[PDB]
Amino acid sequence: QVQLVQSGVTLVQPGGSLRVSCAASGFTFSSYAMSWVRQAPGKGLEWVSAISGLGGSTYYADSVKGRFTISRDNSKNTLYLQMNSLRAEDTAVYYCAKDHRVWAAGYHFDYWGQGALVTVSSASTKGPSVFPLAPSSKSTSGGTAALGCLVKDYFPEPVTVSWNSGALTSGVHTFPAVLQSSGLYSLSSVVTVPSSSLGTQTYICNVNHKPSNTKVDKKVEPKSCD
């Protein structure tokens, strides 16, 4: 019955402004202080700000003090977070969190919202490059060979990677993306196959990046190397 309902993925430019919200129900909203807690990609939980039940007192982490404003509407049970002067390092999931107890002090959270990803970046939508990672003597360990596709320079996430339109799945590894210094993402998807049948089996990686309506089919062929 206690629900905290949040917004969705949003893109903003560094220096930009964004207002994130959380609609609450199933409890006396005005009695509870509320917080925003963020999580940067692959990082731990970071408390951002809090606001008392009535809104007379607001608290902020030093990292956001003069840039973020917490507020609430106790008429329509809504929590807000105005984020001005945004920076790349504010890229994170933002969760609304209701205090466990009605007390004035001791902010710890019994219910959480599903989170809202806020991405701060001066990058434009771009489809990936798809290069083959060719099997060879140097990517062969006895009876097994490795091959793959390097899915590079794309923005924003996600990108999906299938092999042989879904027919190939055992031994597949699509690595998590890494953000490059350029502000574009890159990942590689690899697969282990029998090296004995490299000259006979065909391997195609099917790369799809919905933001830029990109759907690439790249045949991965062997190279002598040695």
Next chain:
Amino acid sequence: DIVLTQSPSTLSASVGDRVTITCRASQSISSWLAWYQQKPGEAPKLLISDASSLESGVPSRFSGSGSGTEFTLTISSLQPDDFATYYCQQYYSSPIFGGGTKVEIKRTVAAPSVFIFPPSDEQLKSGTASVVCLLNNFYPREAKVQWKVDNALQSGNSQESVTEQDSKDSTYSLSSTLTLSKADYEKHKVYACEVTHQGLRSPVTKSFNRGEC
């Protein structure tokens, strides 16, 4: 303001183990500490409040103890549903979280299979050279990957990515990607990936010669 430190940062446990996670505060917080559990793609879940008060619906398996600057979350006998990250959080002053402790699936040592990929000619036509070194199906996570070009140790021109533990075999896979410009890639001959892992009797080096590859 109040720094919370968790030890260990990663806890390799097997099902049925008695698991202990400690939280150390920079100053006394009396007993105003909470513990949360978080799995990937999910919001945290409150387990314990006021250092030892177990949240409703939380299994009896989980228990909390401590006060002042030392607190401990204990799981009596680990279950499959307990592999996750656990965070401590103080609320004596403005709230702060600890860094988190990942409870991960312990399995037996598995040496990595090392593979190396030269840059394709198509990428070289675009002006960039990406050299990919794959360490496949290994355990534990700890591994050292060094890039050498004409026996010159490289630093800061490669970034790595690791998969989450495999559903079937609980192993990890890792990719190390060295990136250069094509102009710079063409100035060197030998490209080597040296892998140091506790499952390998000695370091494995996968290398190629630019020209032959």
